[PDB]
Design a protein around this nucleic acid. Structure first.
Lengths: 222, 210
DNA sequence: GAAGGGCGCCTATAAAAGGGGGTGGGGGCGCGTTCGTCCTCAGTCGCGATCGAACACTC
DNA sequence: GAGTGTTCGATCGCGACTGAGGACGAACGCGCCCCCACCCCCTTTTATAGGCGCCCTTC
């Protein structure tokens, strides 16, 4: 009992299955399967030198498809499953392949219509516009700038310096995570002018290029 | 090998990119390019945003071509507040020491009526209505565009091509109440303000009130 | 719920001070690119060593 | 008579010589981030008028 475990029962039972190719329009008729899922009935006639299989649509499904049998030789085919409980199972080995084809029921016109019917689209072609002039309103002030304004008026970066103390305490917190930080990142924790900040970082630390040019600051090892 | 001009150089691309959005004649743009160059050469206003100056140069050139475009319009193509454009504008007038001209309603009769696809007869009727109204100073307060729009409204209301004030208001950008007020100011003379060569679609008596 | 008109708000100008901002101008340090230098092997030939061989001296 | 030692010829090993190829670097190059420099930005009152947003009500 494991997710990657495949049931081999079908194969080991030598279970056989049949494979049939079916056109989409018929398959679209089949998605409307009558009742629980019945679509019709299959008829099989075998003779001493001729074998005929065909399928006939359910009268409900209607509101003859001959089969062409194909070889499965050259490539062994088996069917394997994935449950809705994600369990894996091998149901069987393919003992027959076949294709559903039209017979004496159509030349081309309906198929052409069927193709047309499936489409029902303008392919994407540019069908005019004909002519318009959707000129764009002047908003007396830049909208986003204006939107910026509602936000801007709420708070300023021009804050006070009652902190020749609260900022150093915060410095212990940051530098506890890493020895050195970028000046912009130091600016992010702070709410004070960089020049004032520069005065602080000079006071308890020095700085680097860290081999990356960037003004990176750290606490004094001494 | 030219860092000093590079904001000016970019400004004329941005001037061109600003003239591009509303299909402006190149002669206007050229004077504008010349105006900036002059403003640049003074450098006295180097403590100012280039894009505002470009936009102000643009407002001036239209007036210099006798076809001003509203700041509201000029705002549509720029980020600069009308206030800063006006501010920069004043500075340029002082910077370049040159006078300007007063606006006329008829200069905007063309495109707005065009934007409404109104026939020349309505367009021309509005212009007279506007012209007669200003000569009589029937509206010594409201902006001439606001006055013009109501005249256009009145005119449109005097033809089959009637439109709601909000649509007109939407096209002119003015408040729908401002037209409504301006209309209240012109309405007393609605009948006599019309040109002598006109064909009513609705009697002046039957002109709506608001 | 959606439309509408009325209330009330904003703006525009004038004048300056204190503190933070911001853009421009200027500059420094790292990363990216390209051609030249350095290293190596293959190939031929001269050169030195080694194998082949004859004559003179001692036993 | 026979046995041993020495040297030029000859034979074989060697390395020098020349070129092409692969890998390396350094000069050249790119751009961001740093900082100083220059100068706006915010607030109030008093007066005025134009434009205007939001709410309340009614459809």
């Amino acid at each position: 009992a494991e997710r990657g475990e495949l049931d081999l029962t079908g194969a080991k039972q030598n279970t056989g299955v049949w494979l049939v190719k079916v056109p989409k329009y018929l398959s679209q008729q089949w998605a409307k399967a009558s009742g629980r899922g019945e679509v019709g009935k299959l008829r099989i006639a075998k003779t001493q030198g001729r074998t005929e299989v065909s399928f006939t649509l359910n009268e409900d499904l209607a509101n003859e498809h001959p089969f062409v049998l194909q070889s499965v030789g050259g490539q062994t085919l088996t069917v394997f499953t994935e449950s809705s409980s994600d369990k894996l199972s091998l149901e069987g080995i393919v003992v027959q392949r076949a294709e559903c084809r039209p017979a004496a029921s159509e030349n081309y016109m309906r198929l052409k219509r069927l193709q047309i019917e499936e489409s029902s689209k303008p392919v994407r072609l540019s069908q005019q516009l004909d002519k318009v002039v959707t000129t764009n309103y002047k908003p007396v002030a830049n909208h986003q700038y204006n939107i910026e304004y509602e936000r801007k008026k709420k708070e300023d970066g021009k804050r006070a310096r009652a902190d020749k103390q609260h900022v150093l305490d915060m410095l212990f917190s940051a530098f506890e995570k890493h020895q050195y930080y970028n000046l912009k990142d130091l600016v992010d924790i702070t709410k004070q002018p960089v020049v004032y900040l520069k005065e602080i970082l000079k006071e308890i630390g020095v700085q680097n290029v860290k081999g990356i040019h960037k003004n990176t600051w750290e606490l004094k090892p001494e | 090998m030219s860092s000093s001009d590079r904001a000016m150089m970019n400004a004329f691309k941005e001037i061109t990119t600003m003239a591009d959005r509303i299909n402006l004649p190149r002669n206007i743009v050229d004077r504008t390019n010349n105006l900036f160059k002059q403003v640049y050469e003074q450098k006295s206003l180097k403590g100012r945003a280039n894009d505002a100056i470009a936009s102000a140069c643009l407002y001036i050139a239209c007036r210099q071509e006798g076809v001003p475009r509203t700041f509201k319009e000029i705002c549509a193509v720029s980020r600069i507040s009308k206030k800063e454009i006006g501010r920069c504008f004043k500075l340029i007038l002082k910077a370049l020491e040159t006078s300007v001209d007063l606006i006329t309603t008829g200069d905007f009769m063309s495109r707005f009526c065009s934007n409404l696809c109104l026939p020349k007869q309505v367009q021309m009727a509005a212009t007279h209505i506007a012209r007669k109204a200003v000569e009589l100073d029937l509206v010594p307060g409201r902006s001439p565009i606001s006055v013009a729009a109501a005249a256009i409204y009145m005119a449109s209301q005097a033809s089959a091509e009637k439109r709601t004030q909000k649509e007109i208001g939407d096209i002119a950008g003015v408040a729908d109440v401002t037209i409504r007020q301006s209309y209240r100011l012109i309405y007393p003379r609605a009948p006599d303000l019309f040109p002598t060569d006109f064909k009513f679609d609705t009697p002046v008596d039957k002109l709506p009130q608001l």
